[PDB]
Paper text:
The receptor assembles as a pentamer from four homologous subunits arranged α-γ–α–δ–β pseudo-symmetrically around the channel axis. The large extracellular domain (ECD) harbors the classical neurotransmitter binding sites at α–γ and α–δ interfaces.
To explore binding determinants underlying specificity of this compound, we obtained an initial cryo-EM reconstruction of the muscle-type receptor bound to rocuronium at an overall resolution of 2.8 Å. Further focused classification revealed two distinct states of the receptor, one with rocuronium bound in the pore and one without. Both structures contained clear density for rocuronium in both classical neurotransmitter sites, with loop C propped open by the ligand and the ECD in an expanded conformation characteristic of antagonist-bound and apo Cys-loop receptors. The decreased number of interactions on the complementary subunit compared to succinylcholine may explain why rocuronium is able to bind not only muscle-type but also neuronal type receptors. The extracellular domain is more expanded than seen in the agonist-bound structures, and the channel pore contains hydrophobic constrictions in its upper half. This extensive hydrophobic barrier was seen in previous apo and antagonist-bound structures and would prevent ion permeation. In this rocuronium-bound structure, the upper position of the α-M4 helices retain map density sufficient for modeling and remain in close apposition to the coupling region, contrasting with desensitized states where one or more α-M4 helices are detached. Together, this first rocuronium complex shows how the non-depolarizing blocker prevents channel activation by competing with agonist, inhibits the conformational transition to an activated state, and stabilizes the pore in a resting-like nonconducting state.
Residue numbers in the entry:
A (entry chain B): 2 to 341, 416 to 500
B (entry chain E): 1 to 329, 410 to 489
C (entry chain C): 1 to 334, 398 to 469
D (entry chain A), E (entry chain D): 1 to 331, 370 to 433
Amino acid sequence: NEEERLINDLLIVNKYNKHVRPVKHNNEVVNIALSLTLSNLISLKETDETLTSNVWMDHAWYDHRLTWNASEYSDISILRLPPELVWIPDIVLQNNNDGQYHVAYFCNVLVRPNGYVTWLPPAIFRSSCPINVLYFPFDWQNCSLKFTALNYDANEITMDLMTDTIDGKDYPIEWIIIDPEAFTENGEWEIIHKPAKKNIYPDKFPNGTNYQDVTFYLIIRRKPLFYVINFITPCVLISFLASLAFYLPAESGEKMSTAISVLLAQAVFLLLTSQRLPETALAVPLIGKYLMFIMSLVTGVIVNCGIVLNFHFRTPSTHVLSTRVKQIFLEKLPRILHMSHDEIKSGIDSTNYIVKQIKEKNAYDEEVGNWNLVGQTIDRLSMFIITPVMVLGTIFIFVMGNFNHPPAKPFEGDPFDYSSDHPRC
Amino acid sequence: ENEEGRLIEKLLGDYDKRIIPAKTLDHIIDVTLKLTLTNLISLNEKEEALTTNVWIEIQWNDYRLSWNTSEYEGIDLVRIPSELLWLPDVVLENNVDGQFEVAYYANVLVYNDGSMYWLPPAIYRSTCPIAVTYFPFDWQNCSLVFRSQTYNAHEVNLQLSAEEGEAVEWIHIDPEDFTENGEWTIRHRPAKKNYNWQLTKDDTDFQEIIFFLIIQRKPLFYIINIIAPCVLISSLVVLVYFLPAQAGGQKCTLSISVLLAQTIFLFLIAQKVPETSLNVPLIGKYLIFVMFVSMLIVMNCVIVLNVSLRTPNTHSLSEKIKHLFLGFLAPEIKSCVEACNFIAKSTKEQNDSGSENENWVLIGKVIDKACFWIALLLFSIGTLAIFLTGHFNQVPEFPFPGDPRKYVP
Amino acid sequence: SVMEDTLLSVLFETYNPKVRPAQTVGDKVTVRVGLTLTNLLILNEKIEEMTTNVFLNLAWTDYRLQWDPAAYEGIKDLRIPSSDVWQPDIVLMNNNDGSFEITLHVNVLVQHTGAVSWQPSAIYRSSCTIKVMYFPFDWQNCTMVFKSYTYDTSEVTLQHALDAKGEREVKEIVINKDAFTENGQWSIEHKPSRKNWRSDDPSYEDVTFYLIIQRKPLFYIVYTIIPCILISILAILVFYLPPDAGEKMSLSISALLAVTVFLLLLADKVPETSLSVPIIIRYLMFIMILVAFSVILSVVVLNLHHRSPNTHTMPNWIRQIFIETLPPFLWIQRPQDLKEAVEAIKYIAEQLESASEFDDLKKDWQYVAMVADRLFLYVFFVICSIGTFSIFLDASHNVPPDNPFA
Amino acid sequence: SEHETRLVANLLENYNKVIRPVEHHTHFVDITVGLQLIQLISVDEVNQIVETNVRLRQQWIDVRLRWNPADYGGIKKIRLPSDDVWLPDLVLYNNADGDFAIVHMTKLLLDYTGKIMWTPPAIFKSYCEIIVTHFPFDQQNCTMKLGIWTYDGTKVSISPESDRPDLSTFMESGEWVMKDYRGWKHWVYYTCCPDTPYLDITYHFIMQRIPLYFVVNVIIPCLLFSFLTGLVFYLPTDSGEKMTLSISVLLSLTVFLLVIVELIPSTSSAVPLIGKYMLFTMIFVISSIIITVVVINTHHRSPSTHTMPQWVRKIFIDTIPNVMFFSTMKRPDVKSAIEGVKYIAEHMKSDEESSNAAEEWKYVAMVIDHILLCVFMLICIIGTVSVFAGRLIEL
Amino acid sequence: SEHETRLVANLLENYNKVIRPVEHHTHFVDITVGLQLIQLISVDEVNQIVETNVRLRQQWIDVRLRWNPADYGGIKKIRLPSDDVWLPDLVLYNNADGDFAIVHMTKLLLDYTGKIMWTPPAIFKSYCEIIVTHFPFDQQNCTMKLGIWTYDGTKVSISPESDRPDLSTFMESGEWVMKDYRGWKHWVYYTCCPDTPYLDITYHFIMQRIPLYFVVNVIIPCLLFSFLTGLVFYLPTDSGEKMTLSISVLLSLTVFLLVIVELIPSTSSAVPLIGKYMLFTMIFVISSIIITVVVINTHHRSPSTHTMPQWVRKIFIDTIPNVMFFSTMKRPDVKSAIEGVKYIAEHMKSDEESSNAAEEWKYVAMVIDHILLCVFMLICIIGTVSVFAGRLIEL
Ligand SMILES: *[C@@H]1O[C@H](CO)[C@@H](O)[C@H](O)[C@H]1NC(C)=O
């Protein structure tokens, strides 16, 4: 096997020092072109704002020491060397969560006779991307993977986006590479944009490790089906049930029970929602806004049911039905609301007394009925005022939520799509 | 100077730890295992894993590490780190995680005759499939399977350690220092050498040493926190039969509230039972039973309320039902007299309607009494049977059903 | 290059990284310790642990790593793997786990003058005690203590780091705006640095970095306080409900259910330390006791309403207090056949009169219940408003000091 | 053994473990790959991760590790550390969050002809496209893709050992059933060049869930709540408990939502079967509550304000009650005294008239209750059957 | 430092770190072991594991590592990597789930006379019997057993640095108070042979829980619910809400049982104090509900079908109300018309009699309620005091 002789010549006879940059003079710059391939998006659990992803880092650089004349040996046009034997550019994910800066598997490098070295190690990365909860669960997130070279400054090695050729002209690969066949879409998230950028920071200096950067962005949109089915629709229906309390007669002593039970169910939904989101305080989530609004409205409904019951049960022995109240709630509003021989002397005295008592009882009852009518009018007015508010508020909130598509072009000031279909020039 | 230095430098010179110490061809190295249990840390039903702290004692002979004591001032025992010596790759096979090896690599005690005594401590997480049928009144039968992951039966011979000529066929537990788990008690602890007859003396899986832990749960926590509150709350459904059957009686309130509490208990128990789906746990069976009985009692309360609130106008009380239930089970003078007669007639009619209503109420009360007796018997019998099945779920008297031996020191 | 190989071979022929670099026996190595905060990940209050992503800006001088650049084609500095040179064992001493050392061993920068610079990255989990009294309206004071685990003041001398153009010391955590993520739950108010000694032990010295951080309580505000306020409104409203509705107990006891549900919600978020009671728990307990007292007074009012002469005799003090005095203050202020027929009519009249008197006494009892209910309404409204306002102002007056004292 | 010590010393004296074991660099090493499934540790539907405990059996020939047994006392096999010899870098291509390659560098068996057998253990966490359409009666098909990471098919070729994974020593899951399993080899080419095949072996296991835990823990309580839903229509309106009962059923279902949320997977790819069933139950209960409110309002209608429309009377008092076979429902001062007696009599006239009208309203409410009870029991049965039997027949 | 470089070079040239540091093999290495407690990380009651952050100070003499200061520029102390020299294998015997030995090989301080000082850090996760009988007012005694794993007392002897662990730099826990701490050395012999002592050092810490978190978050709501369940008996039966109140209290207690099971430890060795109190409260509420049902049944007792027994009247209407001092409870067609009036009068008579009997039943029910209110308030107070007073006084 000529490979043994070739590798011995390359590493042992030539005294290859893997701790020294591959430059002939110690002022040149080693160019490392790197690219990212997304094998699968594992998770974006929002509680701790961590993006877990399976990615393949592609590396490419030149090493003049690993060059040979293929004819002087057998026609060997490629080699596989372990990375522990050759110089490797340590490019680390800087914004990681768990303390894993490096790739998971240190695979062999590939070397051509001209010294071109390609390294494609796979990695699982857990990067931190903050969550914008403003339109949850109709939100889209903008997570980033930031790669820096902390072993050498910018004067020593330059990071670049990898390039590819189609028809004799090479262009940079300004996006995350996704294999359409192998890639399986995430259960919860849809990828909208995936740009890549090389960032320079002019306020720093080239003789530092915080001057260069290569960032890969993932603009992903949540798929709102689990939440729509399990959280929003049952909550919306249970909230709409609160308006029926006004249609429920006061004689059926269950207005307050209905309203309070609706409030309790909404509290349960609030408890469920609280666990799904981080503790951040940038904004109230859309679902949180709706829950607050609906809980306040249902509390108002409970208060108004209490007032109606207080009105319904007034009697002439404890309250006076003033003329103003009678006119307002029996003439105006119902029209506006389109609402729908001593023994015989003793006997005579006894029957007169009975008649007087019955007349008094009848007057008492009719005024009680007047109070009942006042209560019914208040119910009708409350329903007409609150049901439209509830319905319109719900509709407005959730169409605002449903109208939150990503901007369709990342980097607002940029006219480029960063799409793999249309490379620059 | 320490003679041990010269002796060890002589022994380890020209010593290859990769090479099994087989003296000649067809020589099989005898490796004897003795497991000591320090703590039964836990048995996680959700993960179906048993965590134990054990001191595993491994003994074998390495002829290369023998010396003549007279040449080294009577030194007959040295300590050499295990990373410098050949070791039999004795590993726990049925581990949930990827932890096959021991936790701490202790020094190996080497005697002048070549005998080697290794006692590394280990924390092991082994698979213990859970028999959920009688949970929480259950006992589990967990095993620790040990075998060599490198050498087969032609190279090593796994055996149980023998002390004073008697095989130690059980997990050793020191009576004083051992601490009870607090949720589990150990009833049996046999050990035996097993063979996989589907394989040949190759494959390294032909032979193995299995240590068994037959442990019984102590269901005090579950009894005090779930069972007793659940039983007391569920028994309340028989009280609905003594409440009046009209507005303000609150039959439906009580029955449906008990059902809601049982739903809460269902949520509470969902977090404890293992997720396997081969059997329904006993506690789950009892919850299903009480929920079904509460549903039946709600149905019966609704039927009783419907019967008791009937009116001559919506329904007609046929005499057949009455027997069935109340048995086996000047012009001014003329106008004034007309008014008086009409008043009397109206009062009579109202009183008659009332009487019919009271008849319906009595029928409802009779139904309440009958259904109360039925429901009390049903609930009592069901609860007693379900929670007496668990009480008789006893660990077998012998570690191995058909084996007469007790496997104890 | 070839010359870099030659220089490295010359520098490390007899260099021993285990030996601390001291020209002469008794010399001390000056180590400059700086910190750059890249991200304040978490401040887990259950375990009292702060997770941060930081860089350590370390600098010292190693006399052995000196060369003349003129003789090596003007090589001014080298990037040497960190394991090939002596380094001070600068560690985080107050770590919550057992991880003292850095995570990423970036190679050092060595200059021809012997100046060594090292900027390793780490994910550190430090332990800071949480002052759980104004939670969630609280500010915390979490520190990071850095010192050499091995060498003492007789061997190394810790100092503050220098700025980019080293002219004066930087006595703070450095935050690079290009690479820094705001937590979103915590605001950094102060971030000073200071050296600390110990009077008892003269060989101890460390560099401590203090983070004064204020919480943003919006999440807790919404998810706990707003529902509590609504429940308190319902608890007050129970006293406006008429006793005849048969709904007082439903409302009050359901309010109690709601408060206990909110306690269940909050259980898994409050730190489990016993030095004090967080203000949020105090507010929940105040609302819980207020609702319980509303239940008790509702029961009392219902008992008063359903009294009658057949069971109770109304005492003089109740009548005087609840009918004469309170109402104005509370603004309430309220032939054989003929003989038989005659006897029947007389008996009917007598029955009606007795019923009228009985109903009058019952109405007196019900009016007493009404007046008591109005009084309780006003008293509970006042108490709830005062208590809630007091607690909230106490919470809102909790602010970190202007001077960090560090 | 001195013989074996000498043999091992001689074998590795001039052995370079970075060079492929080929006599000429244009040849390829042939590796026989076999997968032995030992246990299915868990399936994670939300993250789409299947965790398995396996053994990866690899066999190949290293020409550089030959020897003549006669020269070494008859030794024919030895065990060597896997780190001492060239190994193929087999990588789990669809790894989710586990280890990409083998990490347990166990010892390997080497024959005197150079034949090598290596069976390291591993824990494979694979990406598993989970389908929740029929949950919990769902069948999952997901794979383990294996290939040589850094070598193409012209340098290292891999061939499956058998037609399917070896499940000889497979522990029974207790939550899944191995319906089928197989392994296929694929040749992948690129537009570059058709002379550089890229090989991989995909093993797929078809799993059938055992739907007992989820049945008893989720579906049965939903059935009880659905059954109780229609029970409110047999409860008379006189007992002020119609809303109490129906609302308590709704609250019980809402509390049970906690159990569903903590038990069922939280994926958004599709709606699970039990998701549809529980949504149906929710809407069923809410409709029952709405119609109960309507009936209660109807029962208490007062004659003074509302007068019975003619069509309501025609339908609910005359037509429907006839066609309801199950039900048993029916289908000086003397002048003042005289004037007062007349007044009492006429007041009783009016009271009786009002009572009769209110009674008609109550009767209409009762008839609506009976119709709704029939309709709601029928709807409950039909909906349950329609949701479940469709999938259940296929099994 | 060239002097120290030369010293280290000459000091490890012929140093074998596998060999004990004794001049003669019949001597023993005397190691001074000291434990410094930096922080009490956590106490796990369920698994009975105590997690502590400690420094394990060790001192011993290594004659092979001595030098003459005059030959090296006066150097008297150097720092060496601990993995370069022989170290004692101290092992935590009662390790639950942590590391058995030191894993952080920090540098050690070496004096020119051979004296060595090594103070590596460690996280000890030690198993200790947790006694939950007075929880949350429980005192725990948890230990750390240390000893040399592979050497007996005749080869390597360990002795405590002092009689107590060093807590000079201890961090205040915030959940536990450190009552006491001590260290003891034990000699253990075996039936083998009495000339080979086996030495271990056991450190134990007496910890007292700070019972503020658990009090506020568990016990107070239980007290509140107990008070309310007692209160149920003052609610008149006419207001149809007795069952509402009592069963709502039971539901609140069930939700709070959920909370408790979330918070309190799930041990099973014995019933904690909170467990006994929670069970007592549950039984209290259940008995309250049962007796409330009895009272409701008595109140709605029909005089038509039931007649008051004489003993009931004698007890509850005559004697009991007298001893209730604090209470305020009481201690042609003309013939047809005439016959109709007579019928009205006699029906009024019958109705009055029935009403009187019903009122008597209601009075009996109200008296029973008063008695039970007193009884249940007394039981609530007595039980609350009984469950806790013994432990509170013990402190
Ligand atoms: C061991 O060495 C002694 C000399 O010290 C010798 O007399 C004795 O025979 C030796 N033992 C054997 C078994 O040969």
